[PDB]
């Protein structure tokens, strides 16, 4: 499935 983005940007 994957783990969600925890950073300020998607880069």
């Amino acid at each position, epitope marked *: 499935d994957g*783990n*969600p983005d*925890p*950073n300020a940007n998607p880069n």
Partner: antibody, heavy 129, light 107 residues
Framework: QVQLVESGGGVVQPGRSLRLSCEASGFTFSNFGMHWVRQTPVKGLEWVAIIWFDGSYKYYTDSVKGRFTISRDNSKNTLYLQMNSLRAEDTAVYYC??????????????????????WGQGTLVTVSS | DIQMTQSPSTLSASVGDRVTITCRASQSINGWLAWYQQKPGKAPKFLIYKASILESGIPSRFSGSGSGTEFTLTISSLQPDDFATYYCQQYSSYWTFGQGTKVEIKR
């Protein structure tokens, strides 16, 4: 150079508390999610907790829920782990680590997942009666 | 949790050897597999992500392949600083690690 410097470990009896700190330099700390991970000789590497870049969300591994709190102070570039109600089995080296897009940097879309790249030097936590 | 298993747990090798380490998952993890290197008393170091992408600055003798439940890390020609423990990690659902493979000096 990315740098994560930890402190706060020690030897305590069960039921007591410790607070770990992890101070970041060399990158924009407030842009990154952060993790705690721990290591023992018998059980290996175990993920502990994650916190969002601005502290707006966080979650934990089952065995520490209700006892550990992850927090951060983006004005001091510091990540914390508050460890209450310590148990002998929490004995480990504790690492902070920086969240990392686990995919080509220029790719954007549904097939992305996140892991973590740079680890701190570790601090030792020993819990024993 | 997704269970990760590596093989073998200890691998003996000589400088110049081609060395391959395998990592299996208890269910498909797509390509969300990362590899870390650790030496005694030091923090793990990020090597490879999405099974086959080298982290910037890692030497090109390292490479990775695999999908689904079966992955490998290969060092094409082992150097003296490559004797270490290597860990796989799935990041498809939370984060779980293999038990580590120690690469030791053969004699």
């Amino acid at each position: 150079q990315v740098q994560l410097v930890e402190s706060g470990g020690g030897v305590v009896q069960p039921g007591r508390s410790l607070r770990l700190s992890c101070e970041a330099s060399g990158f924009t700390f407030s842009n990154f999610g952060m993790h705690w991970v721990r290591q023992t000789p018998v059980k290996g590497l175990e993920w502990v907790a994650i916190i969002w870049f601005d502290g707006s969300y966080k979650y934990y591994t089952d065995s520490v829920k209700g006892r550990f709190t992850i927090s951060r102070d983006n004005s001091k570039n510091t990540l914390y782990l508050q460890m209450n109600s310590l148990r002998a089995e929490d004995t480990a080296v504790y690492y902070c680590a920086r969240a990392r897009k686990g995919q080509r940097s220029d790719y954007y879309g549904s097939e992305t997942s996140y892991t973590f790249d740079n680890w701190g030097q570790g601090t030792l936590v020993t819990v024993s009666s | 949790d997704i269970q990760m298993t590596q093989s073998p747990s200890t691998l003996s090798a000589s400088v110049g050897d081609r060395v391959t380490i395998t990592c299996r998952a208890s269910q498909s993890i797509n390509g969300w597999l990362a590899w870390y290197q650790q030496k005694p008393g030091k923090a793990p170091k990020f090597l490879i992500y999405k099974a086959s992408i080298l982290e910037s600055g890692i030497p090109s003798r390292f490479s990775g392949s695999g999908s689904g439940t079966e992955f490998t890390l290969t060092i094409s020609s082992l150097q003296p600083d490559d004797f270490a423990t290597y860990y796989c990690q799935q990041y498809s659902s939370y984060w779980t690690f293999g038990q580590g493979t120690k690469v030791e000096i053969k004699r």
